[PDB]
Amino acid sequence: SLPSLAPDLVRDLIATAADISLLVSQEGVVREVMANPHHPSFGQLSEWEGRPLEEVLTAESVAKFRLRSEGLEPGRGSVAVELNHIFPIRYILHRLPADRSILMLGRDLRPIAEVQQQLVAAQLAMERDYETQREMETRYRVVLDVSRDPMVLVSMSTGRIVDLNSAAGLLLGGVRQDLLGAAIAQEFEGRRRGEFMETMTNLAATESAAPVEVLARRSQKRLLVVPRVFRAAGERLLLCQIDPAD
């Protein structure tokens, strides 16, 4: 249990547990301000002393203080109320027995309000990144799908079709679901994964050289394939434009 505590130490304990503490007379005048020597900001509230508590509360807080305080009788009890100064504060109120004065023990709510504000910013940032990602995905789909230039997108490591448009589908002789994930070499008669990917890669590396001549299995069309290599998110992709050769 708590041993005996000198008045000076009791004042210091209270002042340090609370962020801001007020002694207020029965008349409603701020008799003493005790601010936490550890807690930031406060301490310029020297000026609050001698002045009406109502002078440092919003309209809404005054009425609220009045209501919750009128009932408060001096004894074993306390009551809690959130108030706003000219910043938000949780006060626990005690009425002292000798002169009906009110001791208000304040817990500063600015730190929690501050992190909430950050969370609000965080959440708006996520909305922005999500919308912008969807906007880019849509531009990508739109440009690729509407384009009359037959194009196929191929993964350099797997040799598989990762995307294409319907114009490529027509020239290749297949529908989207057949062609997505299909090994590109295997769509052309006589080609195999190894040598075909090496051909495209070498081709893509020189601007002056002709396209590759292939025969599409499904459509039985001779086609000219023109490959371009680029990096997307680290990964190497081949973008091939295809034309009828005959």
210 interacts with its own copies by CB under 8 A? no
231 beta partners: 236
Q: Does 211 bind its own copies (CB under 8 A)?
A: no
CB nearer its own copies, residue 55 or residue 114 = 114
The residue to which tokens 């969370």 are assigned: 119
Closest separation between CB of residue 203 and its own copies, Å? 14
**25 part of the interface to its own copies, by CB under 8 A:** no
Considering only CA atoms, which of 17, 47, 16 is closest in space to residue 30? 47
Q: Which tokens go with 212?
A: 């590759």
Q: Applying CB under 8 A, does 202 fall inside the site for its own copies?
A: no
- Site residues for its own copies, 40-59, by CB under 8 A, read none
4 lines the binding site for its own copies (CB under 8 A): yes
Q: Which amino acid is at 206?
A: T
Residue 3 binds its own copies (CB under 8 A) = yes
Q: Is 10 in the site for its own copies (CB under 8 A)?
A: yes
One residue of 1, 44, 46, 206 binding its own copies per CB under 8 A: 1
Long-range contacts from 211-218, C-beta under 8 angstroms, 24+ separation: 211/243, 213/245, 214/188, 214/189, 215/188, 215/189, 215/190, 216/171, 216/172, 216/173, 216/187, 216/188, 216/189, 217/173, 217/186, 217/187, 217/188, 217/189, 218/172, 218/173, 218/174, 218/187
Identity of the amino acid at 216: A
Query: Does 107 engage in binding with its own copies (CB under 8 A)?
Result: yes
- Determine the Cα–Cα distance for residues 200 and 195; give it in Å rounded to an integer: 9
How far is it, in rounded angstroms, from Cα 141 to Cα 165? Answer: 9
Q: How far is the CB of 126 from its own copies (least distance, A)?
A: 5
Place of tokens 């340090």: 16
Q: Whole-angstrom Cα distance, residue 109 to residue 122?
A: 20
Stretch that binds its own copies, among 16-24, 51-59, 194-202, 203-211 (CB under 8 A): 16-24
Site for its own copies in 161-200 (CB under 8 A): 163
Out of 63, 67, 122, 175, the residue judged to bind its own copies by CB under 8 A: 122
Residue 220-239 contact track with its own copies, rule CB under 8 A, x = bound: --------x-xxxxxx-x-x
Cα gap 213→224, rounded to integer Å: 5
With CB under 8 A as the contact rule, which of the stretches 65-73, 142-150, 179-187, 204-212 interacts with its own copies?
Answer: 142-150
Among 103, 152, 161, 203, binds its own copies (CB under 8 A): 103
Instruction: Tell the smallest beta-carbon distance from residue 232 to its own copies (Å).
Output: 4
- Which of residues 27, 130, 192, 195 is near its own copies by CB under 8 A? 130
Binding of residue 131 to its own copies (CB under 8 A): yes
